[PDB]
Structures are given as structure tokens and as C-alpha cells.
């Protein structure tokens, strides 16, 4: 499941559109990465499958606030 654990980012659908303007179905899909975040609050490496951006959001909101979600959302981590 290509899905960013922090921002729900799955892949999306769209056309390709040539010069001749030809529709062709395709997908846009997230820049995911799965990264080993250090928590300290837990003395452990929780390692989420995260899309860059999701990254930017951890870097802002804070891992403790992000893992706060999920926990509160049902997710594993």
C-alpha cells in the first residue's frame, strides 16, 4: 500500500496528454520513503513509511505529535 503514514497520501489518477492532446490513463504517486525516526520519548526507533512532506510535517509538528496521531487514529507505529 503506497500510502504515507502521516499524511494519507496515496497514489492518484490522471491523464498523460500528448501534444496531439491524447488522453492516456496514468498514476501520480507519492514520494514515500520509510525512515527511522528517533523518539527519545520512547528510547527507540519507530520507523514509519513516510512521504517527503510527511517528513516536512514531522520536522514541524514534531514526532511526538505525529505518533500522537495514528495512536489516536488506530494506526500501528
Amino acid at each position: 500500500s503506497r500510502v504515507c503514514q502521516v499524511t494519507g497520501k496515496r497514489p492518484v489518477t490522471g491523464n498523460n496528454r500528448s501534444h496531439a492532446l491524447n488522453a492516456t490513463k496514468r498514476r501520480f504517486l507519492p514520494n514515500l520513503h520509510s525512515h527511522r525516526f528517533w523518539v527519545e520519548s520512547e528510547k527507540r526507533f519507530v520507523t514509519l513509511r513516510v512521504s517527503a512532506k510527511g517528513m516536512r510535517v514531522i520536522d514541524k509538528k514534531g514526532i511526538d505529535t505525529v505518533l500522537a496521531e495514528l495512536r489516536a487514529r488506530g494506526e500501528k507505529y
Binding site: 527519545e40 517528513m55 520536522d59 514534531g62
Partner: protein, 149 residues
Amino acid sequence: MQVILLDKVANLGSLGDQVNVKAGYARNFLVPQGKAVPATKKNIEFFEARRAELEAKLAEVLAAANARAEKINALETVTIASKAGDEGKLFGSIGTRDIADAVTAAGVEVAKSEVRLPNGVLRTTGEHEVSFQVHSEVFAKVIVNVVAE
């Protein structure tokens, strides 16, 4: 990704200065490894409240005993002296406990030789006012009365 620092730190470090660093370096090294913290604004006061409750607080908490010499601005009662010699001139020296003898009952009682003037300590008249070690800054003033017996 600005982040504020903890310990020193190579090419930016400063125990708490305001840096702006490549994200990587941070989330991959600095933080989760105790060395920095997001400049979460909540923090830019959390660690500025120190820059004020300290560098202008405990740097003023130092000044509560000006010169330490407060009401001792009129010299001190000369109990005894500090010695003499050479039938007129001077000869005797201050043992590692002998500048108190005179001012030996004023402030608080101690006994150490934090020597200040690395000379043969001039031998003449008697009464002199240099400074002595009262602290890492201020000074003090009193005199020295000899003993005729």
C-alpha cells in the same frame, strides 16, 4: 529548519545561539542525539527567557555588595599592626596569616594569602592603600597602624 542549539557544536555551535541549518543535519544527527531543537517559536522564548533571566538577571544578581566595602569607607580600628623592624626602617614580613592582625576583628575571620603585589613589599612609612583580593572585580580600602612597644 532553523533550530536552536544545546551543547557547543562545530561550525555554528554556541550553547543556545540561533542557527539555520540544512534539514538533514538536524533530523538525522543534531536533534535525536541531543544537540539542537526546532525553533518552534514556543521555544524561541523558552530559550530567550534565559537570555534575559540570566545575562541581564544573574549578571545583576552579582551587584548586591558594591565594592563589598560598604560602611568600611572610614578605615578600621587598629587593634595591633602588621610589624616593623630595622631600627627605624622595616624588616619583618607578613607570614601566610598577618595582614589580618590589625583588621583582625572587622568583617569575617579568615586566614589565607591570596597575594596581590608580587614585589618585596615596599619597606617604608607603614600606612598604605592598595586593594587586596576581595573578589574578581571590586576592591577595598583601609590602613595600617604600627605598634610602639
